[PDB]
Structure formats: C-alpha cells, structure tokens
A and B are shown apart, each in its own frame.
Chain A
C-alpha cells in the first residue's frame, strides 16, 4: 500500500539495500492536508536502517524504491502504517499517510 510519486530526480543508480542506514528528511501530512510530523522543523535528519522494522512498513518499500538525492511523495495506506489502532493523539484510526521524503544519503 505504498505509492511513490517522484518530486525531484536523484542519481537513479544507487538504491538502499537491507542493513544500510538511510538518512532522510521528511514531512508527513494526513491525506486530507493536515501536517503532523516533519524532520525539517527539528532541523535534524532522520536516520533508520532498512530491514530492522524501525519504521512503519510503508517506509520500508517506499524508501527502498528511491535513489540517493531523490525527493519523492509516498502515499501509505492505513494497513502499511498504524492502521486501525492508529497513533493515539497524533494519527486518527484508518488514516492514509502522505509523506514528502528526500533521501539525503546512505551510511
């Protein structure tokens, strides 16, 4: 349930594989247009490693399809995010999440 729509092209050659740390800058909004999270506000890039289930499964496939330097828009269905339980106080249940993710680098 992840759809990846490109915003700005990357290198198109290097892609993140399993066990590699991904450094991304993201801004997450509900699909109706309400923002709820953004790494830009904290002014600190978000780091995570693929395959360790550190993030929601929607980010697992979405970032894997992106290249280094690419900025893309990921639309994640409720099943590939928090879903029925949701995130209490942040994300309502059965909410589709839209993310503007830029893959800064891999480490």
Chain B
C-alpha cells in the first residue's frame, strides 16, 4: 500500500481542506501558548470604584471573583441525585488552579519570596470561599469518577500546595460544623475505584499493538488511542496528593480527623482506606514481576507501566508518611494494627528480585533508579 499511496495533489479539494484543518489545529493552534488565567483572576478580584461612600456598607458585597465561587458553591449544594457534567465549572476550575502555582541554587531570600507569592495567589481564592467549594464539589460527586471530580481535586491541590495552614483550617472548620458524611463517603468510593496494574488488560494491548490497524480515509500509523492499563493513574496521584496536602505541615487536627470523625453519625477511616489501596497496588506489582520473571529483558511497554505504577506507589507512601508524621500517635497505632506490614513484606519481595533482575542489563538503568527511590 505504501507504493500505491495517493499523493496529496490527487485528492479532491474538500478532502484536502478537511485534512488541513486537522493538521493546522494540532500543529499551530494547540501548540500556541496563551496565558490568560493570571490576568483573568486579577481582573475578577478587583472591586469597582465603590469606595466613595465608606458607610456601614462594610458588609462588602462579593467581588466578581467571589460571586463566581458562590455560584459554583450554589450548584454543588443543590439536592440532586447525580452531579451533572458542567463544562463551565471545569473551565473556571482550571483557570483558578493555573493562577495559583505559576511555577540552580535558589538563595534564602527569594525562596521565601516564592512562598509568600504562592500564598498570596492562594489567598485570592480561599478568602472567597474556594476552599469550601472544593469540599462541596467532592461531596457532590458522591464517589463517581470523571472530569468534574478531577478538576476539583486539581484546584484543591493548587490552593493547598506548600501546606497552606490557613486553607487547611478553613477546610477542617467547614467539615466539622456541617458534620456531613458525604465528603468521606465520596473519598472512600473514589479510592475503591482507583485502578491498579491489570495483566489481562496489558496482554490485550500487546496483541492490539501487534495487529497494526489503519483507518479508511488515508492511513493512521498505529493510532495511539487511550491506554487501558492504569488509565486513571494521574487521577490516583492527585487524589492521594490532595489527602497528603490536608496533613502537610504536621496538621495534627486534620491527621486525627481523617482517622475518625467524632461529630459525624458514621466514621470512615481514610488511613485504613489508603492501606487497602496500597495492598491492591502491591499485589498488582507482584503479579507484574512474575509475568516478566521468566523473561530475560523487560520490553518498553512493560517498563512504562512499571514506571507509572511506581509513581503512584510513591504518592501513596508519601501520603501515609504525612498521616503519621508530627508524630500522630493515633495514626501510628492505626497503621500498626492494619495490613500495612503485609504490603511492606510484599514490596520487599518485589524490590529484592527486581533489583537483581534490572541490574543485569544497562538498558533498564533508568527503571532501576526509579525503583531505588521508591524503596
């Protein structure tokens, strides 16, 4: 078929134009960089020349940015069976998230300046109810994965980066006064839907990539449709990153609250739930090692799936570390009596055998480096 491929000048004009539009948007429109999140948030955070009266109006009606957060907080608190998909919320959640981070020997002076600049950008949101909105949206999804919850988690991480104590206090206060069980029920459900390494899915992909499929209108060179092995790995990382940031800075009050919610009618132990996912991830990694144990060299697709599994395992270990540091005696006792020891025993078996296997060929040195820091 290569030697009989039709040249572009023999195609009809309308067909060639359609191909041009697809090529132009991918190479020229998508690649274009336009940063407007900082400018948009700055414009919405300004009160408009209403300071010529300075009376008892000190109630200080919300600024345009504040009204935007209240509107999304309004639809999150609406009594509905399912949180319907909203592109407007997703678009603005990304805008708010992208406006808060904005980020080889950095000195002490500017290191603090970056932290203070980071705090100010986060302050523009959590002082306008953004911290409460994130919790409401998580509780509204009721444990259903999707673009809505993923956008909410990214926004929550954006305002919690660096261990923002002020945001943590606002989130903790809101949960304790409402005494709602939906937030942790949603979190627990999301963690149970997180995927691990599936060998059956991996085996199917290897056969699929060996067929070499093409399309009708032209010919696609091994189309790269969505990965089906740990497809939501990025979602899993931010879900545990969000939980880690709730305890960042050794917030003992939030560390105890994750283990037990005293005011709620029912209690969910998030600390134990994290260990449950770690066991499932560890078992999947152990199964993956046995699959390649007979084989002499791990091929490229296997190494990539190993790398993303280790990245998720790093976040879970970091999240567990943040739960107990400070130290939090209650969380330490909870982990001691949990199945964490079984997971650690399993990881040691995988670590010992993978180190010996990976060291036998220099083509897998990068994977070995990632394995070592995971240990």
A and B touching (C-beta < 8 Å)?
A: no
Binding site for A on B (CB under 8 A): none
Q: Which residues of A contact B (CB under 8 A)?
A: none
